[PDB]
Structure formats: C-alpha cells, structure tokens
Amino acid sequence: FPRVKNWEVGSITYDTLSAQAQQDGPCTPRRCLGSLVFPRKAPEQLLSQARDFINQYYSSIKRSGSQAHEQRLQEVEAEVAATGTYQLRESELVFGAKQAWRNAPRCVGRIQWGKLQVFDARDCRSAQEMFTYICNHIKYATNRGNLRSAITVFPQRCPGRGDFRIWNSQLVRYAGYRQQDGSVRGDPANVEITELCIQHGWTPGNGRFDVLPLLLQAPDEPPELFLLPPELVLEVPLEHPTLEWFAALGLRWYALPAVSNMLLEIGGLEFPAAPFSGWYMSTEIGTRNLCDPHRYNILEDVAVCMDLDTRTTSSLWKDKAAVEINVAVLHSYQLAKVTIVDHHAATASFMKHLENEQKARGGCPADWAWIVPPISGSLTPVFHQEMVNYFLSPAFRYQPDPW
Amino acid sequence: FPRVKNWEVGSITYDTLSAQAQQDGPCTPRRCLGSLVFPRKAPEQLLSQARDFINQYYSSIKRSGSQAHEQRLQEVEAEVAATGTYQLRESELVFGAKQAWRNAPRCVGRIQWGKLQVFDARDCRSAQEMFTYICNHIKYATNRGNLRSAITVFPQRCPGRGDFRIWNSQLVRYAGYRQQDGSVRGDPANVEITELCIQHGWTPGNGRFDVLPLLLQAPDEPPELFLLPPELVLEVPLEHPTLEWFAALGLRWYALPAVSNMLLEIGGLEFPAAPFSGWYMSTEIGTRNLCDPHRYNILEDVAVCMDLDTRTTSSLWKDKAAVEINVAVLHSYQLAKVTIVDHHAATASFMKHLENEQKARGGCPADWAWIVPPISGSLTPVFHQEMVNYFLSPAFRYQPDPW
Ligand code: HEM
Ligand code: HEM
Ligand SMILES: N=C(Nc1ccc(CCNCc2cccc(NC(=N)c3nccs3)c2)cc1)c1nccs1
Ligand SMILES: N=C(Nc1ccc(CCNCc2cccc(NC(=N)c3nccs3)c2)cc1)c1nccs1
Ligand SMILES: C[C@H](O)[C@H](O)[C@H]1CNc2nc(N)[nH]c(=O)c2N1
Ligand SMILES: C[C@H](O)[C@H](O)[C@H]1CNc2nc(N)[nH]c(=O)c2N1
Ligand SMILES: [Ca+2]
Ligand SMILES: [Ca+2]
Ligand SMILES: [Cl-]
Ligand SMILES: [Cl-]
Ligand SMILES: [Gd]
Ligand SMILES: [Gd]
Ligand SMILES: [Zn+2]
C-alpha cells in the first residue's frame, strides 16, 4: 500500500483503501495524467457491483453477515436474474448518495458527507414533476441562506427508455451571451447552455447575471424549459468591507451551488439526473468564477480601481486584487447571512476528514490538484499533504452532455 | 499519446514524448501517486543506457548515425569492457547536464535550459579541491547579483570507489537549532545538517540566519567541515517598500539557490556530487521558506505587524500577509540588484517553454503540483494547463542522504 506523508508534520499513513479501487484512472507507470480534467474520458458485471454495494451498506450499519445482509444479496441476485436490473431500497439510496459524496476525490467539503438530505424522486414521471422536485430541492437547500446539503435522485437509467437529464450544469447559472465580437456578456462558462435555452424558446436578457431557465429532459422527450421563480433563487450582491466603490462593480453571485450534470452511480445502477447541492467555498466565486481569464475576468478592473501598478508583474497586483475580491465574497455572504466557507477553514476541515477516513477506511481518495485551493495553496494544510487519487463506487461521475 | 488541453484557451496538444519515458513512476491505472514528493523512492545495463544517451547526443547535433557516432559507440563499449565504466566527452557532459535540467518535471524555470555553465570538476580529488571548485562555482554563479546558471560536475560514482558527496542540501543554507523549549531557531529544514556540522567541529551561532558550513565528502573519507568566505555568500536583507517596520523583523535570504544533494544521471553514469544553481522564484522564499508552518513560519508575525484580524480565517489575514511578504522579497532582491523572478513571469515563461518543447520534441514532462506556484495558483497560466509527468534521462534524481 502507498505510503502517504504529511510534510508539515512528518506524519505518515498508508492508503490501504486504494487497493480496492475498481475503475481505472489514466495514469500508468510510464506517465502520470493526474492533472487531466477528464481522467476517465450486462448481468454478471452488475451483480458484482451490486453485491459490493450491498456489502458496503451492511458494513455501514454494523450488520455485516447478518440474515438481512444475506437475504438482501439474494434478493438483488433474484431481481437481476428476472429483470436484468434491480431497485435500491430507500435506505440504500440514502447511504449510496452519501458514499458517492464521500468518495468524490475532488471534493474538499467531505467532512460534511454524512449530513446530506436525500430526496427520492425515483417515481418522477415528467419534466413538470421534475421541475417541482427541483424547486423543492432549491427551497430546502437554500433555507433562506442557512444552506443545507441535499440531493434529489431522479429515476435510474434503464433499458428501452431514455434518461432523465438536467441539461444545465448547475441549477443556478448566469447567462453567457456570446457577443458577436467573440466576447461574452455574462458567464462564458455557460455560452452553450444559454444558446440552447434561447434555441428552446427562452427570451434572453442582456445582463451579466441573468439567471438561466432550466432545460429539463424527461425520458425520450426533447428538453422542456422551466423558469425558476425569482423568489427561490437567493443571490448575494457583492460589496467589500472597506472598498466602497466595489459595490459599484455591480457584481453578484448566487447562494446555492447545485451541480446538475453529473451521473450518480450506486451499486452498478446509474442515475443520470441527481442534482446535488452544498454551499460555496469562497475561492470558487472569488478566485475562479470572477478572476479566471475565461470567466468574468474582473481582476484587472479591480486592480486598476485599487490603484495598483498593473504594468509590472512583480508588484503582485494580481495577487492583491484577488485577495480583496475573495474578501468581498466572504464579507458579502456573511452580511447576507448566506452560508459560505473560506479556503482556510475548508482545507482545515478536510484535514480532519482525511484523519477520520484513515481511521474509518484506511485512506481517502483525494485529488491534490483540486483539493488545494486556487489561491494561497501552501498557506493551507492540504498543500503539504500527500494524497492518493483513485475511483471508488458509489460515485459521482462526469457524463456526456445530452445534446 | 495523451491528449493535453489548456482550459483557459481550449487548445489541444498530444504528448508524443511521454512514449519515450524510460523509468516507471509511482502511478498505476488503479491509483495516481503524482502528489508524492518521492516519486522514485552490471555492464549490459550501463551499456544500454550509455548507447541510448550517445544516440540522443548525436541525433541532437544532426550527426545521426554518422562515422563519429559509430566510433563513439565503440569507444564506450571498449571502455566499459576495460574498466566497468566509461568517461563522457566534455561536450556530452555539457549536453547531458542541459538535458537533465530540460527533463526535470518539477522545474518551472526550464525556459532557460539552453543556458547553463558547466564546470567540469571530474578531475577532483580531496574535499579541499571540492571546496575550491564550489567557491569558484558560487563566485561565478553569483556574479555580483547578476546570477548565472551553473553546474559543477564532480567525479562520477564507479565500482569499488567511494562517492563524492556534498552533505548539505544546498551550498547556502541557514542553520536550525533546537531546545528543550522544543522549537527551532533558524531554518527547521536544516536541523539535521546543523547538528552534523556541530558534531563535526563547527561551533554554532545563535542567529536565525547563520549561514552553515559545508560538509564535503571525498571518496571513502569522513566529511570535512569547510566555511564559506562570507563575502562569497551574497545575502539580501528583507525590507518592504511601504511597511517600514518590515525591516525591523530582521529577515533575510541568500541570493543563490544552489542545489547540492541531487544525483545527476547521464548515459547510465551517476554523478552524486553535481551542485547546480540558477536564481530564485520569489514564492520559493516569500511563500515557502518564510511562511511554511514547518519553516520560518513568519506569517502570523507579519499579520500582527500589519494589524490584521488574526482571530478569524475569513478575514484572509494569511493571504494578505503572504502577499506582502512576497512583495518584500521581490522589492528587496530588485533593490539589491539580485536576480529574482516573480511567479507570474516565471509561469508565463514556462508556458512559452511548453510551446517550444511541443515543437522541439513533441511534449514536455511537467509536474503540475510543482509547476503551479504555492500562491495565486489559478492566477497563473500553468494552473489551467494540463500536464503529463514522466521521467526522461539524462535526469536529476533524488538520492539517499550520505549518512
Ligand atoms: C457542504 C459543503 C460543500 C463544500 C464547501 C464543497 C466544496 C467543493 C469544492 C470547492 C469543489 C471543487 C469544485 C470546483 O472547483 O469546480 C467540490 C467538488 C465536488 N463536490 Fe463538494 N462541497 C460540498 C458539498 C458537496 C455535496 C453535498 C456533494 C454531493 C452530495 C458534493 C460533491 C462534490 C463532487 C462530486 C465534486 C467533484 C466535482 C468534479 O469532479 O468536477 N459536495 N466540492
Ligand atoms: C535559471 C533559473 C531557475 C529558476 C527560476 C528555477 C525555478 C525552479 C523552482 C521554483 C523549482 C521548484 C523547487 C522547489 O519548490 O523546491 C525548481 C525545481 C528544479 N530545478 Fe529549476 N530553476 C532554475 C534553474 C535550474 C537549473 C539551472 C537547474 C539544473 C541545471 C534546475 C534544475 C531543477 C530541478 C532538478 C528541479 C526539481 C527539484 C526537485 O525535484 O526536488 N533548475 N526550479
Ligand atoms: N464541461 C466542461 N468543462 C468543465 C468540466 C468540469 C467542471 C467541474 C465544475 N464543477 C462545478 C462544481 C462541482 C462541484 C462543486 C461545486 N461547488 C460547490 N461548492 C458545490 N456544488 C454542489 C455541492 S458543493 C461546483 C467544470 C467545467 C466543458 N467546457 C467546454 C467543453 S466541455
Ligand atoms: N529533503 C527532504 N525533503 C525535500 C525533498 C525535495 C525537495 C525539493 C527542493 N529542492 C531544493 C530546490 C530544488 C530545485 C530548485 C530550487 N530553487 C531554485 N530556484 C534553484 N535551485 C537551483 C537552480 S534553480 C530549490 C525539498 C525537500 C527531507 N526532509 C526531511 C526528511 S527528507
Ligand atoms: C489543468 C487542471 O487540472 C485544472 O485547471 C484544474 C486544477 N485544479 C482544480 N481544482 C478545482 N478545485 N477546480 C478546478 O476546476 C481545477 N482545475
Ligand atoms: C505533498 C505535495 O506534493 C508537496 O507539498 C509538494 C506540492 N508542490 C510543490 N511544489 C513546489 N514547487 N515545491 C514543493 O516543495 C512542492 N511540494
Ligand atoms: Ca421491487
Ligand atoms: Ca524543559
Ligand atoms: Cl460555481
Ligand atoms: Cl530554497
Ligand atoms: Gd474605504
Ligand atoms: Gd502599531
Ligand atoms: Zn498519476
């Protein structure tokens, strides 16, 4: 098993959990592809994954080898024999979603993994009911700014019927209007979904923070457009505690990060629509979403406004402006009473998570490049922590866009 | 051939050079160990490495397979048959030193790889001569602050003979002293080598920045304790352009990063003593050396002096203090006319190096976790650049401590 060192403390662990990694990553002894954004790209195989999952379930409740464990294994085996697939028990779906979060190598927020509200929407039958489920998710999770982690699980993939899909990458996203100059007004990460919304009859705005409609896909159905009720979309105007002109930038962000395009895989079953939400780490907004050159790209405007020497790199004008933007985000969310965590607190809690998981399971799949925050990397403890990246199931997986 | 994307620009390249990776890294399809600091830990073997290097060499000078190529190959064959090793020609040594730097996946400064002064010390004998070679290295490389990359190559390992070894990890290091107060005065990274110099007759100081003596090891002799003439060790007292109290913290650092504990491998030959130097990237000093919790750990000291609110993480007092420490580093080296590069300029140049290397040989081994700076990660272009990590030879490799 790989030896894993913390270089801040000298402490040494061994990741015995990685030996159990089923699905393969992109690395080989010849070359490491750890930095790649996309690393990854029927009866007996399903049973192997199902059996393994049921084993995980009954371990988590300290009833391994029990009568109930054996009977449930036999029950899954019989259903897979009769139908080629099976249904999770409610309890299993809840456990499976929590495990999928727990297994997500790129999530720094996994200290929370046991605190997850699971909405079972597996009886959903239309895009309209999907919209209702989504609105209930948003209302619950937002909780008027006291954010609560939740996942809504729509029906699993099954042969002979199309998937449920939420086309939007997140439930709340700002329009990106591909301006004609090749530029973008709004969020450039959302130019494609924005144009698909327009294609499907949405009347666009012209702002930088226009909330997109939902394109909800029921099985074998073109996507259907649904407008989120404004009262359900909590937003935070950005201001800075000491730079009063900052508020005149007219920047905003939304309260609720609710990822809606990943596939949830539990015991070999696949849920292509299972949006999940937590709360933001402030660097996601302050550093990536606002300061990435290919996103809102506000770094230079702020630095110029702060009167920084932007003609020379060595003045660290980029670093100084980014810090103040991150300050504005944290200050603004706290002022709005919307849950948010800074990258220092998040990474400190992740270190506690790693320690819990070493005790609980003998390791923790972690993607160092994604866990270390995009600013102040070595100022956080995770920078100094060696990490082992591997794929466990249940899992949140990337999947092709449905168009 | 791995596809490699830049996510800021969307451009795609294919790393065809990774296919030539000679050694095996720690990663497998089951688990990625790319974040590990220590990834790595007979005549037919030596010959096959020697041959491949000679082929590399003659290919790079467009003497592909010519008459000289065939004669050099036969020379090394007879040498190894006669002696068990062989001797590099001076130009092969220069070529091999440059390629070992060029191949170093964790070096962000490789845009400079074609410019390296190679001091051939292979005739060295006795630690006394080592010291002279090292002093001439330090003097040449420092160049009154106009730093110039240089390597001094001491005699290679060979059968039955000892090794030349520089016990110090760098030619310039500050001492670290412990107490039954528990803490360390000076650099905690150098506590081991500091007690060794003391155990070898050096009488210690009591300062935070006591430059260490050199512990040089001729083959099969005890290490000999040499003192660097203080006018050879150019240092930069650290001050801040606007925070006038920063100078009163008494911080300083040295001009010349000269790494003296890595092993240089060329053509199956191993040079355990081959110190190389360049110049610093500012984050190495201002972020890692001064702000790492297990190094000088000054961040809270600086934040207190900046009157920052250190009781909550969300004030980003750590980020603001780090930025000003990096400012002080850049300002102090520039005012002292000592070569230094900030992390924005260095990562921008590494992007240019990536493009040059894509053209030169179809790719470039790069370790994302080490190329991305330890502050302002995503504010630099390398953050958004997927990278392939692999081991090429000639190479610089870690090696066990002599003791
Ligand atoms: C409770 C507070 C949470 C915080 C602060 C948090 C934080 C984060 C952050 C900062 C990322 C990286 C996102 C990016 O850079 O694009 C991430 C990734 C991720 N999070 Fe969490 N998270 C939280 C809750 C959750 C929940 C409730 C789930 C699912 C039930 C989840 C699942 C994931 C997954 C699967 C990823 C990886 C996404 C990818 O690979 O692209 N997280 N998390
Ligand atoms: C000329 C200016 C140079 C700059 C600005 C530079 C910058 C850097 C930096 C910032 C690192 C990371 C080191 C750390 O974080 O501890 C590094 C690593 C490295 N550099 Fe460069 N470097 C330069 C020249 C050179 C030269 C001349 C050589 C050898 C001839 C070299 C060989 C290496 C190697 C082997 C590593 C990897 C060290 C390791 O794996 O531990 N570099 N460089
Ligand atoms: N898809 C593309 N790129 C692309 C690929 C991957 C990603 C990953 C972005 N994850 C969003 C995300 C994920 C996880 C967490 C957050 N935040 C949060 N705190 C939370 N949410 C939910 C619970 S916590 C946010 C983003 C973009 C393509 N672009 C062009 C052609 S393909
Ligand atoms: N040695 C230990 N860890 C350890 C392992 C690896 C490293 C890598 C750092 N190499 C120093 C270094 C290397 C390369 C570049 C720099 N900077 C520079 N700009 C230059 N130099 C020379 C030319 S450019 C500095 C550091 C520490 C251990 N600690 C405890 C038990 S083992
Ligand atoms: C190329 C690189 O993998 C890519 O830019 C990654 C790096 N680390 C990241 N880390 C997080 N949390 N989110 C990201 O989008 C990225 N992007
Ligand atoms: C654990 C982790 O690999 C380790 O802290 C690495 C991360 N990236 C780094 N990057 C650089 N340039 N130098 C380092 O020492 C490290 N340390
Ligand atoms: Ca049933
Ligand atoms: Ca005592
Ligand atoms: Cl986001
Ligand atoms: Cl250093
Ligand atoms: Gd003000
Ligand atoms: Gd004061
Ligand atoms: Zn890897």
Q: Which residue type occupies A218?
A: A
CB contact under 8 A, A9 and B319: no
Whether B155 and B33 map to the same domain: the answer is yes
HSE-CB for A80 with a 13 A CA cutoff: 20
**Residue among B324, B139, B186, B180 nearest B247 (CA):** B324
* A244 Cβ neighbours under 8 A, 6+ residues apart: none
Q: How far is the CA of B23 from the centre of ligand 13 (A)?
A: 14
Q: 């001491």: which residue's tokens?
A: B154
Residues of B numbered 177-236 whose beta carbons fall under 8 angstroms of chain A's beta carbons: which are they? Answer: none
Instruction: Give the number of other Cβ atoms within 10 Å of residue B38's Cβ.
Output: 11
Whether A268 and A357 map to the same domain: the answer is yes
- DSSP strand E in A334-391: where? 340-341
DSSP state of A4: E
Residues with CB under 5 A from ligand 11 (ion): A 242
Q: How far is the CA of A261 from the centre of ligand 3 (A)?
A: 9
Nearest ligand 6 atom to the CA of B369 is 8
Residues of chain A contacting residue B288, judged by C-beta atoms under 8 Å apart: 378
Q: How far is A144 from chain B (nearest CA, A)?
A: 21
Report if residue B384 sits inside a domain: no
HSE-CB for A340 with a 13 A CA cutoff: 29
CB contact under 8 A, B31 and A9: no
DSSP state of A287: I
**Two tokens at B324?**
């000003």
Any idea what the CATH number is for the domain that residue B224 is in?
3.90.440.10
User: For chain B, percent helix, then strand, then coil, each to nearest 5?
Assistant: 40, 15, 45
Q: How far is the CA of B375 from the centre of ligand 5 (A)?
A: 15
Kindly provide the resolution of this structure in angstroms, with one decimal. 2.0
Residues of chain A contacting residue B27, judged by C-beta atoms under 8 Å apart: 27-29, 31-32, 34
Strands A184-186 vs A176-178: parallel, antiparallel or unpaired: antiparallel
Whether B131 and B111 map to the same domain: the answer is no
**Two tokens at B134?**
């090292």
Report if residue A244 sits inside a domain: yes
Whether A298 and A270 map to the same domain: the answer is no
Report the distance separating Cα A213 and Cα A166, nearest Å: 11
- Residue B316 forms contact with A (CB below 8 Å): yes
Instruction: From residue A251, give the alpha-carbon distance in Å to each of A266, B270, B334.
Output: 39, 58, 37
Report if residue B382 sits inside a domain: no
Instruction: From residue A384, give the alpha-carbon distance in Å to each of A11, A261, A312, B124, B384.
Output: 11, 32, 30, 39, 21
A167 is catalytic: no
Q: Which of B94, B106, B343 to mutate to test the pocket of ligand 2 (most atoms within 8 A of CB)?
A: B106
Report the distance separating Cα A378 and Cα B374, nearest Å: 5
Q: Which residue type occupies B383?
A: F
Q: How far is the CA of A324 from the centre of ligand 11 (A)?
A: 12
Q: Is the CB of A350 under 6 A from ligand 1?
A: no
Report the distance separating Cα A339 and Cα A150, nearest Å: 14
Whether B51 and B155 map to the same domain: the answer is yes
Report the distance separating Cα A15 and Cα A18, nearest Å: 6
Contact indicator for B248, B265 with CB cutoff of 8 Å: no
**Two tokens at B258?**
């000269």
Q: Which of B72, B102, B110, B165 is catalytic?
A: B110
Contact indicator for B253, B265 with CB cutoff of 8 Å: no
Nearest CA in chain A to B390: A31
CB contact under 8 A, B369 and A368: yes
**Two tokens at B23?**
């050694």
B70 is catalytic: no
Q: Which of B92, B224, B270, B284 is catalytic?
A: B284
Report the distance separating Cα A233 and Cα A253, nearest Å: 10
**Residue among B269, B265, B264, B263 nearest B47 (CA):** B269
SS3 label, residue B385: strand
Whether B325 and B268 map to the same domain: the answer is no
Report the distance separating Cα A319 and Cα B392, nearest Å: 34
Any idea what the CATH number is for the domain that residue A353 is in?
3.90.340.10
CB contact under 8 A, A28 and B27: yes
Q: Which of A93, A94, A102, A106 to mutate to test the pocket of ligand 1 (most atoms within 8 A of CB)?
A: A106
DSSP state of B101: H
Report if residue B323 sits inside a domain: yes
Report if residue B2 sits inside a domain: no
B383 is in an annotated binding site: yes
SS3 label, residue A332: helix
Q: Is the dihedral of CA B386, B391, B395, B399 positive or negative?
A: positive
Report the distance separating Cα B33 and Cα A365, nearest Å: 11
Q: Is the dihedral of CA A286, A291, A295, A301 positive or negative?
A: positive
Q: How far is A318 from chain B (nearest CA, A)?
A: 7
Whether A69 and A85 map to the same domain: the answer is yes
Q: Give the CA radius of gyration of chain A.
A: 22
* A117 Cβ neighbours under 8 A, 6+ residues apart: A140, A141, A148, A149, A150, A151
| Residues of each annotated binding site of A | 27, 32, 35, 107, 170, 279-280, 284, 288-289, 369-370, 383, 398
End-to-end CA distance of chain A: 42
CB contact under 8 A, A318 and B287: no
A221 is catalytic: no
Residues of chain B contacting residue A243, judged by C-beta atoms under 8 Å apart: none
Instruction: From residue B347, give the alpha-carbon distance in Å to each of A313, B131, B342, B381.
Output: 11, 34, 9, 7
Report the distance separating Cα B281 and Cα B112, nearest Å: 13
Whether B326 and B351 map to the same domain: the answer is no
**Residue among A146, A68, A151, A39 nearest A102 (CA):** A151
Q: How far is the CA of B201 from the centre of ligand 5 (A)?
A: 50
| Residues of each annotated binding site of A for heme b | 107, 398
Report the distance separating Cα B142 and Cα B148, nearest Å: 7
Q: Is the CB of A108 under 6 A from ligand 1?
A: yes
Tally of residues, chain B: 403
Q: Provide the domain limits for residue A331.
A: 235-257+280-345
Q: Which residue type occupies A234?
A: L
Q: Which residue type occupies B323?
A: V
Contact indicator for A354, A366 with CB cutoff of 8 Å: yes
Report the distance separating Cα A255 and Cα A252, nearest Å: 10
Instruction: From residue B96, give the alpha-carbon distance in Å to each of A80, B9, B48, B84, B396.
Output: 61, 34, 16, 20, 10
Whether A338 and A353 map to the same domain: the answer is no
Q: How far is B186 from chain A (nearest CA, A)?
A: 16
CB contact under 8 A, A294 and B386: no
**For residue B213, which phi and psi values (nearest 5 degrees)?**
-70, 170
SS3 label, residue A271: strand
**Two tokens at B319?**
């980020």
Q: Which residue type occupies B320?
A: K
Report the distance separating Cα A299 and Cα A290, nearest Å: 8
DSSP state of B286: I
Whether A32 and A96 map to the same domain: the answer is yes
For atom 24 of ligand 3, the residue with the nearest CA is A278
DSSP state of A246: G
Whether B195 and B245 map to the same domain: the answer is no
End-to-end CA distance of chain B: 42
For atom 28 of ligand 3, the residue with the nearest CA is A189
Whether B220 and B303 map to the same domain: the answer is no
Q: How far is the CA of B130 from the centre of ligand 4 (A)?
A: 21
Any idea what the CATH number is for the domain that residue A288 is in?
3.90.1230.10
Q: Which of A72, A102, A110, A173 is catalytic?
A: A110
Report the distance separating Cα B217 and Cα B395, nearest Å: 22
Report the distance separating Cα A168 and Cα A157, nearest Å: 19
Report if residue B95 sits inside a domain: yes
**Two tokens at B318?**
């750590």
CB contact under 8 A, A379 and B327: no
Residues of chain B contacting residue A286, judged by C-beta atoms under 8 Å apart: none
CB contact under 8 A, A29 and B25: yes
Instruction: Give the number of other Cβ atoms within 10 Å of residue B45's Cβ.
Output: 9
DSSP state of A218: -
Which method, experimentally, gave rise to this model? X-ray
- Residue A309 forms contact with B (CB below 8 Å): no
Residues of A numbered 346-375 whose beta carbons fall under 8 angstroms of chain B's beta carbons: which are they? Answer: 348, 368-369, 372-375
Q: Which residue type occupies B61?
A: I
A279 is catalytic: yes
SS (H, E, C) chain B: CCEEEECCCCCEEECCHHHHCCCCCCCECCEECCCCCCCCCCHHHHHHHHHHHHHHHHHHCCCCCCHHHHHHHHHHHHHHHHHCCCCCCHHHHHHHHHHHHHHCCCCCCHHHCCCCEEEECCCCCHHHHHHHHHHHHHHHHHHHHCCCCEEEECCCCCCCCCCCEECCCECCCECEEECCCCCEEECHHHHHHHHHHHHCCCCCCCCCCCECCEEEECCCCCCEEECCCHHHCCEEECCCCCCHHHHHHCCEEECCCEECCCEEEECCEEECCCCEECCEEHHHHHHHHHHCCCCCCCHHHHHHHCCCCCCCHHHCHHHHHHHHHHHHHHHHHHHCCCCEECHHHHHHHHHHHHHHHHHHHCCCECCHHHHCCCCCHHHCHHHHECCEECCCCCEEECCCCCC
Report the distance separating Cα A322 and Cα A376, nearest Å: 11
Report if residue A391 sits inside a domain: no
Report if residue A381 sits inside a domain: no
Cα A47-A50-A55 angle, rounded to 5 deg = 125
DSSP state of A340: E
Mutate to test the interface with A, among B1, B3, B15, B31 (most CBs of A within 10 A): B31
Contact indicator for A239, A328 with CB cutoff of 8 Å: yes
**Residue among B65, B47, B55, B44 nearest B20 (CA):** B55
Q: How many domains does chain A have?
A: 3
Report the distance separating Cα A279 and Cα A58, nearest Å: 30
Q: How far is B374 from chain A (nearest CA, A)?
A: 5
Q: 């029906």: which residue's tokens?
A: A155
Report the distance separating Cα B149 and Cα B13, nearest Å: 30
Instruction: Give the number of other Cβ atoms within 10 Å of residue B252's Cβ.
Output: 16
